[PDB]
Design a protein around this ligand. Structure first.
Ligand SMILES: [Ca+2]
Ligand SMILES: [Ca+2]
Ligand SMILES: [Ca+2]
Lengths: 606, 113, 631
């Protein structure tokens, strides 16, 4: 890894220290270099011992005069890449392109070093280990270094613009994958002008991504809107105002499988949520949500609520029976019993309970039949982490459906203890509604605020809570293990004692005392110590830290919610059928434009 | 003067590539394609308020001649007004003209006047 | 103290009012000075009660013409030092340097006053009584004043660099002890150039401190990186990115007992925590943590919590016994009693509880056998001082181990009442766990925030609460004295009245009422007054006072958490054996560099053109308004 890399780098410095030919090369001691060149016995095929050449050394140390003195005796090393392991295709052309020495590049081309020689080393790779990615071919190096005249010379001497890389990259791709410069826009427009012509923008990568989609997923929004400017068509100005239009053809990609919009909204990079603030896509999603999406979402949530209440009243009238046996025991109250399934299905009231139960199970199965094939399309770990997509809301509903499937199987086997999974699935189905709580404006950002907060610092409170109550509950069980439980209560054994302390930490239950009877001496001190250390001390710190956190994320949560609503929009337009979704756009074939949809827009200038 | 020579200190370090303490023509030559220190101090000498100098000196905590964001936030918390941390970075984006993440005396005095 | 200083300064002013020769030397009345010089029988060895020459007065007051007349009169006063108690060796050369007039120094050197004069005054001392300290020598004063030509002349006329004082003050050490100036650092590099020769940098003081370690504990990071300038070695540039290596030889000091790093992190001064953020050391200690320290810390935490739960389940099955006697009393509740020690160990389960107990007591003693030489080595006030060291954690665990060691003997004495120290150790053992909260990034700053908080304002709340609830509990006990206890409760006597009010403040217990039984008159008024004055007045105000302070300290807490982890690292890496750890670095002896270990690192920089353009060309909104208002 990195340690291996630095070790072999230091070994490279050892080998460059070793030979006096290479050492005088990197020192540029041209008087002694004339002696070495005068030496016939000085072998000139001697390369760097860890996979480099002498011209590579002179290119590193920029000693171009020594390079000229090298090129007569061995010009063939100018055409040679060497055999280092991270540096396997590397030529001195790449270093000369990097160090911007046009006379050196011109001298290398005077020997005729091939530009089409490509360099794909192990260090020459997109990596977190790699600090800089510059592409493979020397055109990519000329582009990212931004030397105009060098890449002009490369055009003059070859260097095809159609360049195919490992990972299918092209010059456009590595221009996108770049820390942004306005100079990069000029370089882009330059090479676009020097393109002759299908069109070169049409090619995707090896992954199958056009540079339009790459710019969309990476959000270099200056480059994005600048690339949009070529497709921008203005129509007419008058007075203060200007009517223009856009070709929304490539921005929809409705005919494609993977749309632009679902590509942009599904990304691990953050800044892409900014790129939706560009004007034509903003107007598009605004028009598109405002015309259809909000009534469909309202009626869908309404039908879900109507399902849930029928499920609830199904859960009310479970068939039950008197308890048959006798308890023979104080501290034992269990007067109820399950019915048998032959015993249950007996009445008209049971008949309507059964048809309600049928409604519940036929609403249970459609959740699976809806969403299970959607999971295989995307990565499931990618699917669950996206809070914008509501992954954690998908976590609850599948467990809900699984448990409501399981409880009927538990019924049909005459198995006891169905009340516990029923109690689970009931509260899970009721807390399921907060996904559909997204759609209102007033209701929207609040739930993703609390969803951020429950992951935020709740564990920080919880772990400390557990250890401090693990102390005090044991202390209380030791200090009450000697006397009458008929008077003290809550501290008979350790498991009721810890739950007593959990009840009484939160102040829900009042502190225990009997003022008729006597009380032991230590418990006053211990309980007062617990009260000062727990009740007011860090509970208030939770309030303060909570307020500071809400104060900080108060800006960002609305920015999140704006992306969340259009994520919901593109999801529902994916899954609904198309006769409910007519084409949004302006069919120019009506107007003789032909098979394209546009969008007209205007304002006055400021 | 001391912040002024602090500007030329890091400047001379930017010219000095090998860090030998000199500026050769080869170090000068690599600059042109991208387009001693007392020798450099003397050479830049011919090329070149009290309260503002007093204001900067209490502001720059380490005395490096360059106020960081954390030094500014520590002053901003010492001011007594609540601000988050993103707009503090915008304050650096408001003042850092050459883009070093820092402010000198000269970026400071153009802001005040 | 300073009162004595003002007194002797005033007596000095009395004597400068006294002698008219001295007073004319102050006033530079050179006509009258020629008159007094024309007086031959007058003494010219006049001297104040503090003890001076008139050359001292003229050097204080730049009266160099009178100083020349004194030097023709008595040149030997140029070689006379002071004689006072704060000023016992002070010569006029020092006043000449502190008044920095070159020609007066030239005139003093014309008579040839001794450069090596040692002026070690009581006011010439690094003291909080003293304002500005520089050390003794005239070289120190010429260095701190920044005048080269003076110290040029000093180097020309002797004035050797190798000179120490009390506390081992050399010129480099006092150049460190300064309001930090690159202006002063030019003088530093200048005097390093005038080092014309063993290595002069290798000098320790009387405390044993190299100036490298002095700058490290002082943390003048500008001076530190200038000290680091010659420590670098570049390797290659490559367009926008450049590799280099550092020498980590003096930064380790593993051969020494006093490591550099612990010397840094153990300091009274605050800003030394900033020198953790230096580009040699930061990634180094981060690498050394993330390869080593985090797994060892986690597995040590795991073994510790396993020890604690074994202690807990040992604490569960305490041997009890049926209480033989009769209570013979209502309001009397007991069932059990202590089982005797010979009666204790009778079952196989007794053997199980005994072998569980042995593990707990041997853990208790090996904690002692760990911690004892830590106290003998470092100062306990320093050892209990910093939260960075985790002082009160060590306090509470050593009280824990002391209490369990006590209560085992208390079992062996068959002394009753062992439940109280037993429960003390029981509640302290789970308070002991918070030391290990430091290791998590998601958990670390939180506990040092709360540790900062509990010292802060909890005490401020506590005293006010104590006095108000004392007075109020007495007020309720007096009015509840007159009523039958079988229906009121909580107020039989003043201790249960006090503790009942203590419960009643925090709303833990509901207020007492009987809706059948009648009730006294003024209880309504007093109880409602307490309800408004206590239950929401300062209780809710404590929340806002809490929140503002939390908001203020939440900046600093993350810095402090980043600070404490490397202290933990260097602690465990001092105490754990060397078999688990190859010493980090790069063996250049393999590479023929020889016995010095290095660190290679590279960086990619940006290329801002604007910083280059003007220099090569020369070679050819809320907070902003208030900041303007603050000026
Ligand atoms: Ca140089
Ligand atoms: Ca600074
Ligand atoms: Ca700047």
């Amino acid at each position: 890894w990195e340690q291996y890399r630095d070790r072999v780098n230091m070994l490279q410095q050892e080998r460059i220290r070793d030979s006096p030919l290479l050492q005088a090369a990197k020192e540029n001691d041209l008087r002694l270099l004339k002696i070495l060149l005068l030496n016939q016995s000085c072998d000139f095929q001697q390369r760097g011992a860890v996979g480099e050449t002498a011209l590579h050394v002179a290119a590193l140390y920029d000693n171009l005069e020594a390079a000229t003195l090298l090129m007569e005796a061995a010009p063939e090393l100018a055409k040679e890449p060497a055999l280092c392991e991270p540096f396997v295709g590397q030529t001195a052309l790449h270093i000369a392109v990097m160090n911007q020495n046009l006379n050196l590049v011109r001298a290398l081309l005077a020997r005729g070093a091939s530009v089409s020689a490509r360099a794909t080393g192990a260090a020459f790779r997109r990596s977190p280990h790699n600090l800089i990615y510059y592409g493979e071919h020397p055109l990519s190096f000329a582009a990212c270094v931004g030397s105009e005249e060098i890449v002009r010379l490369l055009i003059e001497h070859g260097a095809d613009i159609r360049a195919q890389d490992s990972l299918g990259n092209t010059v456009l791709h590595i221009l996108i994958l770049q820390p942004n410069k306005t100079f990069a826009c000029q370089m882009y427009n330059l090479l676009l002008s020097y393109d002759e012509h299908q069109s070169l923008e049409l090619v995707p990568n090896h992954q199958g991504l056009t540079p339009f989609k790459l710019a969309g997923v990476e959000g270099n929004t200056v480059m994005f809107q600048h690339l949009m400017q070529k497709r921008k068509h203005v129509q007419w100005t008058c007075g203060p105002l200007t009517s223009t239009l856009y070709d929304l053809t490539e921005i929809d990609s409705w005919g494609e499988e993977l749309s632009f919009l679902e590509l942009v909204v599904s990304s691990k990079k953050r800044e892409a949520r900014q790129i939706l603030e560009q004007t034509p896509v903003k107007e598009l999603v605004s028009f598109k949500w405002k015309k259809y999406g909000r009534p469909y979402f309202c009626v869908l949530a309404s039908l879900y609520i109507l399902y849930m209440i029928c499920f609830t009243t199904c859960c009310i009238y479970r068939p039950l029976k008197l308890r048959d046996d006798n308890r023979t025991d104080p501290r034992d109250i269990t007067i109820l019993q399950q019915k048998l399934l032959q015993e249950a299905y007996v009445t008209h009231q049971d008949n309507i309970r059964l048809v309600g139960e049928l409604v519940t199970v036929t609403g249970a199965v459609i959740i699976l039949l809806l969403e299970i094939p959607d999971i295989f399309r995307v990565g499931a770990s990618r699917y669950f982490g996206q809070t914008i997509l509501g992954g954690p809301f998908h976590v609850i509903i599948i467990t809900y459906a699984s448990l409501v499937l399981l409880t009927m199987v538990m019924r049909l086997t005459n198995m006891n203890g169905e009340v516990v999974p029923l109690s689970f699935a009931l509260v899970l189905g009721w807390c399921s509604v907060m996904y559909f709580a997204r759609g209102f404006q007033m209701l929207g950002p609040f739930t993703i605020m609390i969803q951020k907060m429950i992951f935020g610092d709740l564990m920080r409170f919880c772990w400390l809570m557990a250890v401090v109550i693990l102390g005090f509950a044991s202390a209380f069980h030791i200090t009450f293990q000697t006397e009458d439980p008929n008077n003290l209560g809550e501290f008979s054994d350790y498991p009721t004692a810890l739950f007593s302390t959990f009840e009484l930490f939160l102040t829900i239950i009042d502190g225990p005392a009997n003022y008729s009877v006597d009380l032991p001496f230590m418990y006053c001190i211990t309980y007062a110590a617990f009260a000062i250390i727990a009740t007011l001390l860090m509970l208030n710190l939770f309030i303060a830290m909570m307020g500071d956190t809400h104060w900080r994320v108060a800006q960002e949560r609305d920015e999140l919610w704006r992306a969340q609503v259009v994520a919901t929009t593109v999801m529902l337009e994916r899954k609904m059928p198309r006769f409910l979704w007519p084409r949004s756009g302006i069919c120019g074939y009506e107007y003789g434009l032909g098979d394209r949809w546009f969008l007209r827009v205007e304002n006055h200038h400021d | 003067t001391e912040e002024q020579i602090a500007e030329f200190k890091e400047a001379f370090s930017l010219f000095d590539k090998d860090g030998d303490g000199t500026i050769t023509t080869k170090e000068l030559g690599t600059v042109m394609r991208s387009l001693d220190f007392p020798e450099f101090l003397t050479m830049m000498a011919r090329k070149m308020e009290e309260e503002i100098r007093e204001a900067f000196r209490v502001f720059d905590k380490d005395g490096n001649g360059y106020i960081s964001a954390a030094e500014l936030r520590h002053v901003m918390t010492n001011l007594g007004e609540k601000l988050t941390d993103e707009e503090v970075d915008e304050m650096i984006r408001e003042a850092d003209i050459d883009g070093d993440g820092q402010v000198n005396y000269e970026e400071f005095v153009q802001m005040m006047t």
